């Protein structure tokens, strides 16, 4: 039994989850945890960029697409 | 309003930055003046009292390496080097916080 | 055609290298007396051609050998070290110091100005793909 | 302590006696 | 690991710092009566090989072993020293004092050429890596 | 053979192109002998290239059928 | 994640040729520290290791009377590399993000 | 080929 | 072999001779609609 | 507070 | 084995008697 | 037909 | 020919003697 809802809901977690480990990263580091490596620190903020862009791209073309069908006459 | 509590973190960490640059160019500045104990923050602890209380630092003084006898304790080996981290440290603040709001940014651009 | 200009640069700092560390090789053994085989040091130089294959009209530079560089071999009066000659004549390498500077600027310059090629060509075919939109 | 670490009491003077 | 010129050059400096503390080995003892067993100093030679690792290409300098020199061993007439033989000869090595002035210099010249080298070089290396940036 | 096969052959060369030049620089960052930093710099460079190449192609192609679909009947 | 599957590899290996930077820098720093053994890492296995730290004793060129193995030139020379090797990693992981990236902008 | 370039790894493996 | 100079200003070429034909149609099938779509 | 700085204030004086 | 090479083994002690034990 | 660049086609060769 | 202007001949070969 798919769901397109929990698809979403799932992406949007996916995406959330890798953002808030950046940031809890960047936490860490900024307070001076050791163990903690700057370059990993910048390409997990990068990798976390990466993520929502593909988020952003993604309902952009859900958009299009809803506003082209829901624009149509029958 | 909670784009204050998400950027909070690291606006905070770039102020406290900002007031111990100034703490250690006072004790880069004061290398020759007799008498003068060079004074520092512990960055992490003000920081953890800055988030949990709400927005007068605790000045706390650096233990002397080697006795001079103007009295002076500013060792100038340790004073530059936590002056170049403290530096790397708040452009590296800069770069996160940045980081942050041209994310917000670019949601917000259709 | 700016595409043939990245194989014209890329073939030319490969050679520009390859001069480089010759030269390196030969100043770093100025000092030596013996070879692998026993053999005294011969100092060593690369030889340039134009990359082009019959019909082409201008390529890069290509390494097509290296080649023992021709000078006397510098003997050293010395008929008390193990390795010597007949008369005590040791052979030590014809190495010239001062040409091996030298080719080692010109070949770091000339590096940093293919670099500068690549670079230049790279953001014009950027801006070539840029060309309508 | 560690002799660059952060005390919050100062260092006690330092004098340097001809004599003692 | 290294690069190719890294290692020729970081070779050539490990080489020099060895000739020149076999020379200062040797200018430091160049009065000794004994060692520590009973037996005199024997001046040290530091032999550079050509550390070619293909074939007759390239290759930095290596140092095989530092052998002892084979001289008349200087003898000095002191009966009286428990080192004398029959004859009464105590042997003083045969370490030559302008020989390893001249080697230390020669040593710390070829030392700074090769530091001027790598010095060069790296610019030529820190430039090369904005070529896809 | 058809319009289809020829951009997923585009598609395909295009990957290819961008795996040997990542390829390599794995090779050369593994330390093993023979693989030259210059020709790591300048297959990176192309890959970029043809990466930037094949994104504006998507862009005009995917331009273009907006435009057809656009046409009123 | 595939975008890690795809980044990972540079990641690994710039974090350790930073780890390598370390100890490099620390094998300068105790220089002079009597009976100090000079301490690497085979940058190779590791990274092998990592992609599927144990340190490894320099092997002494110059005996030394206070035990202190650590040579000037062979280390100088060894963090010279990292430092560049560090940089080219820097700029081959950039490359790929600024790809992935303008892959996505539009 | 026959001459490693000054930019390449240690030819030694 | 063709370089990009040739490969885009062609791609431009074709693009803009597309959304000419797709302009001179539609202009055509809007008269003729209006033509049907009268009154006699 | 402070003194002179440098020279006449590191040397060893007599007490006053 | 090559002076700067990698082993998994410490260095013996530099030790230099004055006099032979 | 090229030839070896540098130090040793630029100082004065032999005549022959 | 003015330097740096285009001719459709190449230049003769140079030589440096050192005896004439």
């Not at chain 1, 993604?58 to 809803?66: D, H, I, Q, S, T």
């Not at chain 2, 160019?25 to 007799?34: H, M, R, S, V």
């Not at chain 3, 100025?30 to 130089?45: E, L, W």
């Not at chain 3, 600027?105 to 801006?127: C, D, F, G, P």
């Amino acid at each position: 039994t798919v769901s397109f809802a929990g698809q979403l809901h799932a992406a949007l977690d996916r995406i959330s989850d890798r953002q808030a480990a950046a940031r809890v990263q960047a936490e860490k580091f900024t307070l001076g945890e050791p163990g903690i490596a700057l370059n990993d620190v910048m390409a997990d903020m990068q990798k976390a960029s990466v993520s929502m862009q593909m988020g952003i791209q993604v309902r952009n073309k859900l958009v299009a697409a809803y506003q082209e069908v829901m624009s149509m006459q029958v | 309003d909670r784009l204050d509590a998400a950027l909070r973190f690291q606006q905070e960490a770039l102020n406290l930055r900002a007031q111990r640059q100034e703490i250690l160019a006072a004790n880069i500045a004061n290398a020759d003046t007799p008498g003068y104990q060079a004074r520092d923050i512990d960055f992490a602890s003000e920081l953890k009292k800055v988030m949990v209380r709400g927005r007068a630092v605790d000045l706390l003084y650096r233990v002397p390496d080697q006795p001079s006898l103007d009295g002076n304790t500013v060792d100038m080996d340790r004073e530059r080097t936590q002056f170049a981290d403290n530096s790397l440290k708040y452009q590296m603040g800069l770069t996160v916080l940045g980081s942050q709001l041209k994310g917000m940014m670019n949601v917000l651009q259709g | 055609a700016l595409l043939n200009i990245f194989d014209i640069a890329g073939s030319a700092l490969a050679a520009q290298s390859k001069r480089l560390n010759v030269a390196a090789s030969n100043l770093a053994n100025a000092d030596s007396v013996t070879g692998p085989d026993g053999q005294p040091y011969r100092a060593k130089q690369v030889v340039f051609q134009v990359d082009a294959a019959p019909g082409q009209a201008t390529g890069g530079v290509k390494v097509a050998s290296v080649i023992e560089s021709q000078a006397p071999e510098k003997l050293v009066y010395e008929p008390g070290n193990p390795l010597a000659d007949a008369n005590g004549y040791v052979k030590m390498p014809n190495v010239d110091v001062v040409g091996e500077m030298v080719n080692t600027m010109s070949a770091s310059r000339s590096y940093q100005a293919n670099i500068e090629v690549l670079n230049t060509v790279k953001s014009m075919m950027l801006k070539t793909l840029t060309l309508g939109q | 302590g560690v002799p660059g670490a952060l005390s919050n009491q100062p260092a006690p003077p330092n004098e340097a006696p001809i004599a003692t």
